[PDB]
Each structure stands twice: as structure tokens, then as C-alpha cells.
């Protein structure tokens, strides 16, 4: 099919996604892997994972737009703290781009957001999820204080994900920050490159923790290797869950196996996202609209490196059967600040719509 705005696409139903991508980019992402993009990527997961094989369909419909369609329910659960921003940013698009279901909007918006992150894959995007569902129940969203056993069981119950797929999906923490874990600081990044979809998070979680970016007393947080902040450039935060996954015998080898393996990480993330994005649906009933996902920004191709103030002596290794790679260390004796903005600065307020969540 040829769209009215002269693009040839695979299927006529794909056409409406072209102006949607343009609108998302102009309005909330600005072609950046920044705050609003990150919040939308997080929403793809919180929307999709709220499904349970054991509890049955009444517990939730998976990748179904429930967060948008019932904005006063799940966003107010404690495990969904902070999801309101992404929900309130996407509702105006649901209202305007009113041939595309809420469910499809969430998954597509995440694919568009990710495409702005250098190194990210071009996600598969299937379309045709219905615009009617139910609100999910509480307890379906993993929390950072949870054990590895609890996390792996949650993902197995949601969609049969293997531990390999779970760790693969945590490549998203390469482009991720925390606003609610510590009430005293905002935008605390999980790696030193929160605007780049690289392997730094896998490396940096394996370093010895030396302090905290804010207070020392927060649920779900453990000591960070890069805690220095100044102004709006908040220090790195480490989640208890990521730490636990990096060291648990079930997942340690998988965790380590992504260090300095960018193409493998990106391909693995793409494969697990293909499964996540269709939870609650039979993929044989969704049309392939992958050609309307924007082409992602390329990586520079550089290897992973130890940040200044760290090195191999700081590693806490847990995989007996795989050799840890030889990596360089960035020069300097003290830690560099992790910039608050993609252009290196301190200030870059994003667009935020008011709304019902
Ligand atoms: C065991 C599983 C996981 C746990 C416990 C977890 C936990 C968290 C927590 C606590 C935050 C910080 C929220 C805040 O305080 O503002 C966060 C942020 C984030 N998470 Fe995860 N997460 C998990 C899996 C995932 C997966 C599977 C994805 C997506 C594929 C994802 C994508 C993100 C993104 C992109 C952010 C950053 C949001 C922003 O920077 O504004 N997470 N996660
Ligand atoms: C999916 O459902 C939503 C929510 O019912 C629909 O949203 C409404 O969209 C119309 C325009 O079509 C607006 O006048 C309303 O204000 C929206 N409602 C709410 C509660 O925001 C949406 O149109 C539906 N989309 C599809 C593809 O059927
Ligand atoms: C980032 O900044 C630190 C100092 O904060 C340096 O040691 C490093 O070399 C880089 O310039
Ligand atoms: Ca949902
Ligand atoms: Ca990164
Ligand atoms: Mn945030």
C-alpha cells in the first residue's frame, strides 16, 4: 500500500503508524533517548507483564493498553510508582490517533523511543491488538527488593520467559534512571551512559559498591560503584534486583555474557521484546508492521570500558565458566559526573502533559 503521505508500506493497516511516529518524535521524544523516551520504554514492560498464566485472564490481559484505558487503577499501585508520567503523555495520542488501539500505541511508542538510543535494535512491531480490556490486579510487577527466585517465577508465569530472556530484557537498564527509589534525588542512572543502549550496565553492576547517590536507607537499593553527583547530575544507583541477578548462579553467566557483546545484547533484547510485546495475544493474529518502526541510531562500535575511578580490581565475579573480557579503563583518578542531559549539560526539561493517572 501507498500511504497518503506517499510512503509505500507492507499493509494498508500500517499507514496510520507513520504520522503517529512523527507526532511522538516531534512532541515527546525529539529524536532523543531522554527522559520521556525512557519512561515510555518502562511503560511497555509494565503494560505487557501484568498477565498471569496461573491466575488466568481475570488477573490481566498483558500488552493490552490497560495502563491507558484504566489510568486510575494500575498506575496507583505501589509497584507502578512513577508510571503516571508516561501514561499521561500517551493518552493525548490515543485520543488523536484514534484508529490505533491503546495497546498498539504503547508497544509502538516504545519501539519508536528505543530507536532513538544508539545501539538499540529495530524492534519487531506487530499490530492489531484490540482496544478493549480489563484493569490488571496488583502484585504482577517485579520490584527491586524481590529475590531472583521471585523475579524468575514472575516472568515464567507471565509468558514462559526463560532466565536468558529475563536478563536480555534488562538490557533496558542501559537506558534507565530512578526517580522514586530515593525520595531525595531524581534521575539516578543505572549506568554511566543512560542515553546509549550499550553494555555498560552489565559491566558496572559487577563492580564493588562504594557509596550511595542519595541516602543509604532505601528499599530495593544497594551500594553503587559510581555514586558521585553534583547539581542535577545525579550519581549512579544500583538496584538490589540487578545486583542479585548478576550474582545468582541461575543468571550470573548470562549477565556476564553481555559485557562487551553489543550485537549479542541487542539481538537478544530484540528477541525477548518480540515475545513481551505480544503477551495476551496470539502472534499469528497480529499483522506485521515492522517496516514502519524507525531505523535506530547506530552505535559508535567502541568496546565497553571501565569508567574513571574503577578497574578490574573492583570486579565481583560470579561466572566460573566464562572468561571476563579484557577492557580498557578511561583515564582519571576520580569519578566523572554522569550528565543529566543527552548533550552533556545540566538542564533539558522534557515535555509533560497533565492527565488522569
Ligand atoms: C526484575 C525486573 C525489573 C525490576 C525490578 C525493575 C525495576 C526498576 C526500577 C525500580 C526503576 C526505577 C523507577 C523509578 O524509581 O523512577 C526502573 C526503571 C526503568 N526500567 Fe526497570 N525493572 C525491571 C525490568 C525492566 C524491563 C524488563 C524493562 C523493559 C524492557 C524495564 C525498563 C525500565 C526503564 C526504561 C526504566 C527507566 C525509566 C526512566 O528512566 O524514566 N525494566 N526499573
Ligand atoms: C480506544 O478507546 C479509547 C478510550 O475509550 C478511545 O478514546 C476516545 O477517543 C475519542 C476519539 O475517538 C475521544 O473523543 C475520547 O475523549 C477518548 N476517550 C477517552 C476516555 O480518552 C479511542 O478512540 C479508542 N481507539 C480505537 C482505535 O478504537
Ligand atoms: C570525567 O571527570 C573525571 C573527574 O570528575 C575525570 O577523572 C575523568 O577523566 C573524566 O574527565
Ligand atoms: Ca496491561
Ligand atoms: Ca547505557
Ligand atoms: Mn524517569
Amino acid at each position: 500500500a501507498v500511504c497518503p503521505d506517499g510512503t509505500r508500506v507492507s499493509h494498508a493497516a500500517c499507514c496510520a503508524f507513520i504520522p503517529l511516529a512523527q507526532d511522538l518524535q516531534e512532541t515527546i521524544f525529539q529524536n532523543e533517548c531522554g527522559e520521556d523516551a525512557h519512561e515510555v520504554i518502562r511503560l511497555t514492560f509494565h503494560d505487557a507483564i501484568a498477565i498471569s498464566r496461573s491466575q488466568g485472564p481475570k488477573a490481566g490481559g498483558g500488552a493490552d493498553g490497560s495502563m491507558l484505558l484504566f489510568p486510575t487503577v494500575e498506575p496507583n499501585f505501589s509497584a507502578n510508582n512513577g508510571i503516571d508520567d508516561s501514561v499521561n503523555n500517551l493518552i493525548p495520542f490515543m485520543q488523536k490517533h484514534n484508529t490505533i488501539s491503546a495497546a498498539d500505541l504503547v508497544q509502538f511508542a516504545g519501539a519508536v523511543a528505543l530507536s532513538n538510543c544508539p545501539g538499540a535494535p529495530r524492534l519487531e512491531f506487530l499490530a492489531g491488538r484490540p482496544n478493549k480490556t480489563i484493569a490488571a490486579v496488583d502484585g504482577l510487577i517485579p520490584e527491586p527488593q524481590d529475590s531472583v527466585t521471585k523475579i524468575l517465577q514472575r516472568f515464567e508465569d507471565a509468558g514462559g520467559f526463560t532466565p536468558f530472556e529475563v536478563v536480555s530484557l534488562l538490557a533496558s537498564h542501559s537506558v534507565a534512571r530512578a526517580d522514586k527509589v530515593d525520595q531525595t534525588i531524581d534521575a539516578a542512572p543505572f549506568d554511566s551512559t543512560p542515553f546509549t543502549f550499550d553494555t555498560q550496565v552489565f559491566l558496572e553492576v559487577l563492580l564493588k559498591g562504594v557509596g550511595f547517590p542519595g541516602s543509604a536507607n532505601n528499599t530495593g537499593e544497594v551500594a553503587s560503584p559510581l555514586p558521585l553527583g553534583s547539581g542535577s547530575d545525579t550519581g549512579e544507583m544500583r538496584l538490589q534486583s540487578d545486583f542479585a541477578l548478576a550474582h545468582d548462579p541461575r543468571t550470573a553467566c548470562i549477565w556476564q555474557g553481555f559485557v562487551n557483546e553489543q550485537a549479542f545484547m541487542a539481538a537478544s533484547f530484540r528477541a525477548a521484546m518480540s515475545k513481551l510485546a505480544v503477551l495476551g495475544h496470539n502472534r499469528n493474529s497480529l499483522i506485521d508492521c515492522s517496516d514502519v518502526v524507525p531505523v535506530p541510531k547506530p552505535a559508535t562500535g567502541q568496546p565497553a570500558m571501565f569508567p574513571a575511578s574503577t578497574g578490574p580490581q573492583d570486579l565481583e565475579l560470579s561466572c566460573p565458566s566464562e572468561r571476563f573480557p579484557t577492557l580498557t579503563t578511561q583515564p582519571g583518578a576520580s569519578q566523572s559526573l554522569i550528565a543529566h542531559c543527552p548533550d552533556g549539560s545540566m538542564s533539558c526539561p522534557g515535555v509533560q502533559f497533565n492527565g488522569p493517572a
Side-chain angles (χ1 to χ4, degrees), residues 46-48 50 61-67 74:
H46 287 232
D47 190 21
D64 63 355
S66 62
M67 290 279 180
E74 297 167 69

Side-chain angles (χ1 to χ4, degrees), residues 234-255:
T234 308
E236 176 171 300
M237 179 174 289
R238 185 179 292 176
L239 299 182
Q240 183 280 155
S241 45
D242 285 343
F243 177 78
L245 289 162
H247 298 295
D248 187 282
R250 293 169 283 195
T251 47
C253 286
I254 299 158
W255 187 280

Side-chain angles (χ1 to χ4, degrees), residues 105-129:
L105 168 61
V106 168
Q107 295 307 136
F108 186 68
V112 172
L114 280 153
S115 81
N116 295 337
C117 306
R122 195 182 181 196
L123 294 190
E124 181 180 70
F125 176 64
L126 310 183
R129 300 167 188 75

Side-chain angles (χ1 to χ4, degrees), residues 35 38-39 42 45 143 170 172-173 176-177 179-181:
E35 180 65 26
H38 297 162
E39 287 293 6
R42 187 175 177 229
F45 168 54
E143 295 190 86
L170 280 167
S172 61
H173 283 191
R177 315 191 290 187
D179 306 323
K180 305 303 186 169
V181 173

